[PDB]
Design a protein around this ligand. Structure first.
Ligand code: CDL
Ligand code: CDL
Ligand code: CDL
Ligand code: PLX
Ligand code: PLX
Ligand code: PLX
Ligand code: PEE
Ligand code: PEE
Ligand code: ADP
Lengths: 347, 42, 56, 121, 107, 459, 320
């Protein structure tokens, strides 16, 4: 599309998210969600093809259903108490409806089915935007009402999301579906600490956003969407493969990388609340995410796959466009463990 | 391609670095003195 | 020949510099744990006429 | 803990006015040096990605990265120290104002405490 | 079946290279004789001459921070004192019973 | 402690700014110098410890391990100089970087005043070893070996993090000094039983305990020579050091908790020693011998007596040195034959007499011939186990006899008999290999003159 | 200011640069035809820019210095070996075909970039279109396998679905006996070995599978050897015809912006030429790939970016 139109649509998406984040009236939060949904579709459908159209219509259906459920929860809350402010929910039924709507917006299990297909359909830039920016508003809404959530339902869907992501990432060869399942697992990790501490949720969100930005920018730099296509990256730009391997190790939670910070802090916080079994199961399940990260690293950088003859022309050319902040994102997603006590800033 | 050292960008980068360093040092000195004034050390 | 072998042999100085810096940092960190100097009940001692600290 | 709802707190202040009563972090703080090291690593990675001599491609760019990292790290350290100071202040105030919940434990000596002895055999 | 029976364009497996053939007195460190000889010299010197000898001598003459002869002298003076005064050497109780307050059972 | 740490960190820029043909010389010289600095730490006191700062301390249990870790790097560089000849300068620098990072992680692990820092570094050692195994490995099973090595360790050590955070939430501290001074007994409860298991299994899996030792043969056989050296010498002792540090809070629960592990180790030493008798690979045989020795060390730690601890420390040091030497000898044979099979190259004493002498000395030291420190640890642990129960002597004697049997079997199969006729590429042994064996073997016979240096804090 | 979204936003519109003269033109002829002379003549009379037919080392002439690189570092194939042994066991024929197709794709992208950036038209020899005639002839002669043509078809579809076809296609028609006589007169010993069946298959492919398909979306001028000698009539036919059936009138400024972003950034142009499908003729082992790439990195001005090579003589490196 026209660059002016694209910039306006991106600004509208961001302004809808900010409207959700800064408003204190439930109707304004709903309006922000509607504005974000309205401006999101052309971004996903920027490169016109049947796959993008199918992904866009699936995303539209899911988000419209979630918004309708959220509106119903708001109306029930208003019925049982003449309040519009985002505070304690005031009703057991209203809270359940709202939690399911926000889980559907976030993609938490069992409402995860749309994320892998929407990510596969859209391009890598739309996938980056969808998996990074489209998590801020629902998570902020969940944080604002964290004192109302029933811990059983939140913990159940969090553990389900972790298990589903771990199991579903094992079966994928497409990189975008791998990233989608990783996002589902990380969402499950994020929502398992909302009943106890929202600062841990925000810290995990920041770390995951940095890691996902680094990974998607690396994937865009080496234009590969399949495992075998990424297996050709060493023959042209081995530094990109080495950085990608380090980032993958970080995303698996291996210390002393940055990705070890959120799991460590969440486990410690959950143990402070006399919860022992769930962190153990969560780490055991994150082992699966680490396994398929290791498989990707094996196929990418730790071994050398066969190449083709036509790579000799690619050897002669350099990337016309260089993405700013890629170096900063890699460093932030790799080497910030010693700066852990900085989380007291209420990030 | 064929490019000379872009003196405009180099000048802006060096000026930004120097300005940031001087502002940081001034901020630190002001913080130290104002801390001392509040707690009555010096 | 000086100013030529330096460009190839400058690297050798680095490990040694690290050692002296580590010794300095060890002493500097030691300087922050003097809360009980000459206050232990076992080695409670009266200072010498020209002594300010029992140990440094 | 959750200090979001704490009384007399401004909505978008990075460092409140009461934070200025605390000693500022030194310019030779190890955390500031680590932030500078992070900026240097970012500069090296930027040089490597663009296919440039990693050590000596852009000195101005590396200097800018280091300076920006040091600046932001200094302000972040200030905010972190202020938050921990608030936590300790609230802790001590609450302990002071609720004596019945934190009684003085009657000091006891080991010569009159009976602890079970488990032999290692 | 006109296939070439070749899976891909691959370099042949190279044959291992003997260091002695192109350079006798090879010392097995490097293919360049000068760097090889200096590597041998630095390894032999800094290991055997410096570490293995000087550090061994240093460890042999370490001062007694474990305080063995001090314990010998303390034990000697205590046994001299106790034999002379009729005290029965070592005592069964490590701490004097006067300072332990046992808890009365009253069962 | 920083006087050791900072030069090790400066090893990296020195390596990366070195000339293309001067990386090995500079790395070896500065690693040897760093090792000399480490020697000062050995002086130890009979009192508490060498508490340098709030972050790091040294002890007579940590000092020999630190000295061995610092001493191992020059030997690993010497061993790796050969097979990396046809490698690009950047990749050789990356290999040296991996070795330096592993040394730094081990050095910070062994001091580690606080337990979470110990866990963080104890896990940080996992990455460079994995990269070394799965990148510079010869066979195609290196990927599976690395997967096994990673996942066994992580499955074992993930509950340890939960146990540690729970312990800090309850007690309030994880500093080892406060933990030791404020220790309290563990009541016989199911929660305490599972806490004991979570505290113990992470170190058990890395010993390796019998039945959990599957990863070790794969990782040792598929690793390059430097990786095998470090894995056999230092990485196995991390579990023993952790158990020695952590068994202070597990009392009196350990008295009955130890039985399953004691039985497993006592039978598994016999099992692995017997496995060594029927083995067609040198590296696998050496790995299984390592498993037997570490099982006996597990028995020593579980008995939890002063003689047990002294014997365990001595045996850890001696086994590290001996296994490193044996792996180096096997690699020297492999780089000539390229087969890694015992029965292929035979009668090498006729062709390489001095290397046969090295083989004999290494086999005698592995056989625990007196007065080597191997037998010092072996005998102390045997006496402690006999005091624990007089019936252990049967298993200990069986293990000793089988150990001598397979050690001399390995010596005779490769060094004696008639040379293989069709093998004609067996060149004279280089000065590098001979110096490597000498620098492996001389410290053992020097340490047997001062055994108190490796007998630990309970001496 | 390199072209991008900002340039399009502020001033850069390439529709104003079109002056009815752009008219990308492609000339196609059988081996040893007079098309090269004819194409060159058209470029000079119309004021357009001539593009010599892309060979093995076309990409070498556009990067660094114009000097070609070694055969093992560029192309890994030779036409002389194809002429001598068309059924070579090392799969040289399909490697040659694929490398030539990739070179033609790069040249077409360069020509499109020039036309969209300056407005001056270009004249091309055999382009990505009609490059399949050599593939068809080689398959019918048994020089290549069927999997090779399947791979060629996949790559051709995925690559050529993103460009505009030429406005005018000019064909010079020469009988096979006459072109064989021209080959004999040429004097090249390797070219002497071309059989008549190969030329006949080439010729059959051009008329049967290329002329009608370009007649449905372009404008065709079928010319013979005699009537192609005079370029005045060719040029007159060029101006007389008006293009109103192709996709070019349907384009606008936004499509031109997209195509201009596509033609630059040649790494995106050549993206799908190295798809991970493993045919023995073109797949290369890991060890050979590593060795050849390390040799390529050791080329004088190829280790770093173009402006960051001190060995060439680039100065002020520490401030660029
Ligand atoms: C514990 C904390 C303490 C230590 C911190 C650890 C990390 C520190 C560094 C962090 C990152 C910053 C620097 C990295 C930039 C990357 C550039 C690079 O690749 O190096 C090339 C470059 C040399 O090559 P070149 O001639 O410029 O051109 C070649 C091209 O670059 C490209 O050449 P090529 O393309 O032809 O070669 C291809 C090659 C090249 O590909 C690469 O090498 C990529 C680099 C690795 C990825 C980096 C990830 C980001 C950081 C992660 C760190 C992880 C640490 C956690 C522990 C786990 C370990 C994994 O890739 C491969 O061969 C494929 C196979 C890969 C093998 C397995 C992959 C393992 C990678 C893991 C590395 C982790 C440690 C990195 C250490 C430094 C490495 C440079 O290296 C350098 O010179 C820079 C190194 C640092 C410079 C130091 C100078 C300062 C000294 C003077 C002042 C003294 C200071 C003291 C003051 C007081 C004294 C007076
Ligand atoms: C007994 C006292 C001896 C006093 C004399 C001092 C001897 C200094 C030796 C220093 C350590 C040896 C270094 C190992 C590598 C050898 C280097 C070599 O290649 O030689 C080439 C050199 C030139 O010959 P070549 O013709 O050019 O080479 C052709 C082939 O190599 C063919 O060569 P080959 O066929 O002649 O075989 C090489 C030879 C050399 O290779 C070896 O196997 C020698 C190492 C045997 C020890 C194996 C480990 C067992 C644990 C022992 C740990 C205690 C060490 C004490 C402190 C050591 C300080 C470094 O192997 C043997 O002869 C068979 C050794 C079996 C002996 C079993 C008895 C051991 C226990 C005895 C108790 C020791 C303490 C007594 C305590 C009570 C009384 C106070 O030949 C020699 O010089 C042979 C070395 C002298 C024989 C040593 C035998 C006993 C000495 C053990 C250590 C010193 C004990 C201190 C007590 C003093 C009173
Ligand atoms: C913290 C939380 C972070 C959340 C996640 C971050 C969101 C990242 C999305 C940002 C927008 C898209 C983007 O920048 O691409 C990703 C970008 C890679 O860009 P690329 O894939 O090379 O660009 C291709 C575009 O998709 C192709 O786009 P184009 O070339 O057609 O676009 C033309 C261009 C040029 O813009 C103009 O010509 C200005 C025209 C003014 C019109 C005024 C209209 C007023 C109504 O406009 C833009 O690129 C978007 C500008 C939006 C500004 C919003 C403020 O990398 C990053 O943004 C990473 C940044 C790090 C995270 C955010 C910053 C650090 C925090
Ligand atoms: C990967 C590590 C994180 C990187 C984060 C991105 C780095 C670039 C961002 C640049 C600075 C952004 C700060 C914005 C400037 C002013 C901020 C101020 O106005 O807002 C305050 C908020 O300040 C910010 O939250 C602090 C951001 C600092 C982030 C650093 C913490 C990272 C965790 C530790 C890892 C170490 C990283 C160090 C290297 C970057 C007041 O918030 P408040 O209106 O009252 O309530 C909203 C928040 N609640 C609801 C949670 C209470
Ligand atoms: C080859 C043919 C023969 C030629 C040689 C003929 C000569 C034979 C001599 C060789 C051995 C014969 C035995 C003679 C022993 C006498 C020396 C002995 O007395 O010194 C020992 C001293 O030896 C050292 O203590 C042990 C050596 C140090 C070992 C450290 C290794 C070096 C670092 C290398 C890296 C470490 C790797 C392993 C990590 C732990 C014990 O002394 P000690 O009774 O106690 O007290 C010393 C004197 N005091 C009282 C003043 C204090
Ligand atoms: C596979 C290769 C080796 C891996 C490592 C194996 C080592 C792990 C083995 C764990 C050690 C033992 C665990 C618990 C020991 C406690 C003693 C108890 O089991 O004995 C009786 C317990 O009775 C019964 O055993 C109850 C438990 C029955 C259920 C356990 C399952 C039995 C087999 C499971 C083995 C599976 C191991 C591998 C898991 C994947 C005592 O009766 P009781 O006085 O009442 O209980 C005393 C404890 N109190 C005081 C806290 C109450
Ligand atoms: C409840 C959830 C518990 C989570 C447990 C996580 C275990 C961690 C490893 C998970 C790996 C599972 C996936 C898997 O291995 O698939 C079988 C896989 C198929 O090969 P692919 O690479 O996928 O395909 C090749 C052909 N193209 O087979 C293998 O390769 C197996 C090799 C790896 C073995 C790793 C050994 C792990 C077990 C160690 C013991 C502890 C395990 C962890 C839990 C233990 C219980 C407390
Ligand atoms: C090589 C693979 C080995 C893998 C490790 C095997 C053993 C794992 C150890 C058990 C897992 C959980 C560790 C417990 C974490 C420590 C916390 C703790 O001790 O507190 C206990 C918590 O105890 C538990 O909750 C344990 C529940 C166990 C659930 C997870 C089961 C995992 C598998 C267990 C069986 C296998 C264990 C041995 C495996 C043998 C080797 C394979 C008490 O909790 P509170 O409620 O606060 O206090 C009680 C008073 N109100
Ligand atoms: N698809 C192809 N496969 C193999 N060789 C080709 C192909 N296309 C062109 N060539 C070769 O490129 C050379 C130039 O083409 P041609 O038109 O025959 O000669 P000229 O350029 O002198 O008119 C010729 O030797 C021809 O064989």
């Amino acid at each position: 599309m026209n660059p002016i139109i694209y910039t306006t649509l991106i600004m509208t998406v961001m302004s809808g998210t900010m409207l959700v984040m800064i408003s204190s009236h439930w109707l304004l939060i709903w309006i922000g969600f509607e504005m974000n949904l309205l401006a999101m579709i052309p971004v996903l459908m920027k490169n016109f093809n049947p796959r993008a159209t199918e992904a866009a219509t699936k995303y539209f259906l899911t988000q419209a259903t979630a918004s309708m459920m959220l509106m119903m929860a708001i109306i029930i809350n208003l019925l049982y108490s003449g309040q519009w402010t985002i505070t304690k929910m005031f009703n057991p039924v209203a809270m359940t409806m709202m939690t399911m709507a926000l889980a559907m917006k976030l993609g938490l299990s069992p409402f995860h089915f749309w994320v892998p297909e929407v990510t596969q359909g859209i391009s890598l830039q739309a996938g980056l935007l969808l998996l990074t920016w489209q998590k801020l508003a629902p998570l902020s809404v969940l944080c604002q009402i964290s004192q109302s959530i029933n811990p059983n339902l939140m913990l159940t869907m969090a553990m389900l999301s972790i298990l589903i992501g771990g199991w579903g990432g094992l079966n994928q060869t497409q990189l975008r579906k791998i990233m989608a399942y990783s996002s589902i697992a990380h969402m499950g990790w994020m929502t398992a600490v909302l009943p106890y501490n929202t600062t841990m949720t925000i810290l995990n969100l920041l770390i995951y956003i940095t890691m996902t930005l680094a990974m998607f920018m690396l994937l865009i730099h080496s234009s590969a969407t399949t495992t075998l296509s990424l297996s050709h990256t060493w023959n042209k730009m081995p530094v990109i493969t080495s950085l990608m391997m380090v980032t993958l190790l970080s995303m698996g939670g291996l210390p002393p990388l940055s990705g070890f910070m959120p799991k460590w802090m969440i486990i410690q916080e959950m143990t402070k609340n006399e919860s022992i079994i769930m962190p153990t199961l969560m780490a055991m399940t994150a082992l699966l995410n680490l396994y398929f990260y290791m498989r990707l690293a094996y196929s990418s950088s730790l071994t050398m796959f066969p190449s083709t003859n036509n790579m000799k022309m690619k050897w002669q050319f350099e990337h016309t466009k260089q993405m700013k902040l890629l170096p900063t994102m890699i460093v932030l997603s790799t080497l910030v463990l010693p700066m852990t006590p900085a989380l007291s800033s209420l990030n | 391609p064929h490019g000379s050292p872009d003196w405009l960008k180099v000048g802006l980068t060096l000026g930004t670095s120097v300005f940031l360093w001087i502002y940081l040092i001034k901020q630190h000195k002001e913080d130290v003195l104002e801390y001392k004034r509040r707690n009555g050390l010096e | 020949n000086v100013l030529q072998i330096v460009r190839d042999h400058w690297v050798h100085i680095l490990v040694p510099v690290g050692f002296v810096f580590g010794c300095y940092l060890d002493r500097r960190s030691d300087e922050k744990l003097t809360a009980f100097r000459n206050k232990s009940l076992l080695f409670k001692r009266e200072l010498r006429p020209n002594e300010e600290v029992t140990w440094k | 803990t959750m200090m979001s709802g704490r009384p007399g707190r401004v909505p978008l202040q990075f460092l409140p006015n009461e934070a200025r009563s605390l000693p500022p972090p030194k310019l030779t703080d190890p955390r500031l040096v680590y932030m500078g090291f992070l900026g240097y690593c970012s500069g090296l990675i930027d040089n490597a990605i663009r296919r440039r001599p990693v050590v000596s491609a852009g000195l101005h760019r590396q200097l800018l990265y280091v300076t920006s990292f040091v600046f932001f790290g200094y302000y972040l350290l200030k905010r972190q120290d202020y938050m921990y100071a608030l936590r300790d202040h609230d802790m001590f105030a609450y302990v002071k104002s609720h004596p019945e919940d934190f009684p003085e434990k009657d000091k006891k000596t080991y010569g009159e405490i009976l602890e079970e002895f488990h032999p290692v055999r | 079946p006109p296939e070439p029976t070749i899976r891909l364009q691959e370099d042949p497996d190279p044959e291992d290279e003997n260091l002695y053939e192109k350079n006798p007195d090879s010392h097995g460190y490097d293919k360049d004789p000068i760097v090889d000889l200096w590597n041998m010299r630095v390894v032999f010197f800094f290991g055997f001459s410096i570490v293995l000898v000087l550090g061994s001598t240093f460890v042999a003459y370490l001062p007694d921070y474990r305080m063995q002869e001090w314990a010998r002298r303390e034990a000697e003076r205590l046994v001299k004192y106790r034999e002379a005064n009729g005290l029965p050497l070592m005592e069964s109780n490590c701490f004097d019973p006067n300072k332990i307050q046992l808890p009365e059972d009253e069962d | 402690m920083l006087k050791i740490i900072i030069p090790t960190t400066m090893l990296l820029p020195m390596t990366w700014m070195s000339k293309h043909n001067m990386i090995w010389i500079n790395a070896t010289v500065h690693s040897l110098l760093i090792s000399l600095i480490s020697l000062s730490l050995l002086n130890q006191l009979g009192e508490n410890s060498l508490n340098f700062s709030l972050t790091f301390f040294s002890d007579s249990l940590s000092a020999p391990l630190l000295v061995l870790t610092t001493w191992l790097l020059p030997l690993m560089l010497m061993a790796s100089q050969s097979h990396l000849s046809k490698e690009t300068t950047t990749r050789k620098k990356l290999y040296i970087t991996m070795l330096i990072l592993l040394q730094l992680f081990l050095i910070m692990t062994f001091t580690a005043t606080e337990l979470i820092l110990f866990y963080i570094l104890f896990e940080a050692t996992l990455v460079p070893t994995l990269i070394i195994i799965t990148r510079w490995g010869n066979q195609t099973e290196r990927l599976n070996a690395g997967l096994y090595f990673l996942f066994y360790t992580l499955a074992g050590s993930l509950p340890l993090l939960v146990a540690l955070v729970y312990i800090q939430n309850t007690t309030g501290s994880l500093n080892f000094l406060i933990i030791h001074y404020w220790s309290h007994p563990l009541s016989n409860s199911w929660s305490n039983i599972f806490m004991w298991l979570a505290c113990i299994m992470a170190f058990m899996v890395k010993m390796p305990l019998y039945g959990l030792h599957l990863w070790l043969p794969k990782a040792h056989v598929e690793a390059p020579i430097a990786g095998s050296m470090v894995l056999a010498a230092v990485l196995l002792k991390l579990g023993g050091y952790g158990m020695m540090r952590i068994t202070t809070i597990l009392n009196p629960l350990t008295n009955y908790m130890a039985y399953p592990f004691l039985m497993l180790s006592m039978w598994g030493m016999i099992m692995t020693s017997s496995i060594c008798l029927r083995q067609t690979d040198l590296k696998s045989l050496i790995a299984y011998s390592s498993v037997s020795h570490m099982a006996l060390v597990i028995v020593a730690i579980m008995i939890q007596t002063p003689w047990s601890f002294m014997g365990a420390t001595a045996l850890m040091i001696a086994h590290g040195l001996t296994s490193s030497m044996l792996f180096c000898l096997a690699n020297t044979n492999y780089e000539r034959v390229h087969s890694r099979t015992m029965i292929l190259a035979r009668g090498l004493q006729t062709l390489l007499p001095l290397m046969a002498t090295w083989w004999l000395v290494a086999s005698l030291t592995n056989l625990a011939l007196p007065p080597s420190i191997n037998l010092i640890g072996e005998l102390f642990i045997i006496t402690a186990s006999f005091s624990w129960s007089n019936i252990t002597i049967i298993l200990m004697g069986m293990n000793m006899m089988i150990t001598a049997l397979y050690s001399l079997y390995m010596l005779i199969t490769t060094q004696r008999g008639k040379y293989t006729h069709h093998i004609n590429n067996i060149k004279p042994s280089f000065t590098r290999e001979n110096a490597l064996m000498a620098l492996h073997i001389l410290p053992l016979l020097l340490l047997t003159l001062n055994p108190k240096m490796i007998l630990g804090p309970l001496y | 200011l390199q072209y991008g979204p900002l340039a399009f936003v502020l001033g850069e519109r390439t529709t104003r640069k079109l002056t009815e003269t752009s008219k990308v033109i492609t000339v196609d002829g059988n081996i040893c035809s007079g098309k090269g002379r004819l194409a060159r003549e058209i470029a000079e009379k119309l004021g357009l820019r001539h593009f010599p037919e892309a060979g093995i080392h076309y990409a070498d002439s556009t990067t660094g210095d114009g000097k070609p690189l070694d055969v093992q570092l560029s192309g890994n194939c030779s036409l002389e070996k194809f002429y001598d042994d068309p059924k070579s066991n090392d799969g040289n024929s399909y490697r040659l075909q694929s490398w030539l197709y990739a070179s033609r794709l790069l040249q077409y992208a360069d020509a499109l970039e020039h036309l969209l950036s300056t407005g001056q038209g270009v004249v091309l020899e055999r382009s990505i279109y009609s490059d399949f005639v050599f593939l068809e002839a080689m398959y019918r002669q048994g020089f290549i396998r069927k999997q090779c043509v399947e791979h060629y078809n996949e790559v051709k579809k995925v690559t050529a679905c993103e460009y505009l076809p030429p406005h005018v296609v000019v064909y010079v028609d020469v009988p096979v006996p006459e072109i064989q006589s021209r080959i004999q007169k040429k004097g090249n010993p390797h070219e002497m070995k071309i059989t008549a069946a190969y030329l006949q298959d080439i010729e059959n492919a051009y008329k049967k599978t290329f002329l009608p398909e370009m007649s449905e979306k372009c404008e065709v001028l079928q010319y013979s050897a005699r009537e192609a000698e005079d370029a005045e009539k060719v040029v007159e036919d060029i101006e007389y015809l008006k293009c109103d059936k192709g996709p070019w009138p349907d384009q606008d400024d936004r499509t031109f912006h997209r195509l201009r972003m596509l033609v630059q950034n040649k790494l995106e142009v050549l993206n799908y030429t190295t798809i991970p499908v493993y045919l023995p003729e073109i797949t290369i082992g890991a060890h050979q790939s590593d060795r050849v790439f390390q040799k390529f990195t050791e080329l004088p001005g190829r280790k770093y970016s173009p402006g960051y090579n001190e060995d060439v003589g680039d100065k002020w490196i520490w401030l660029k």
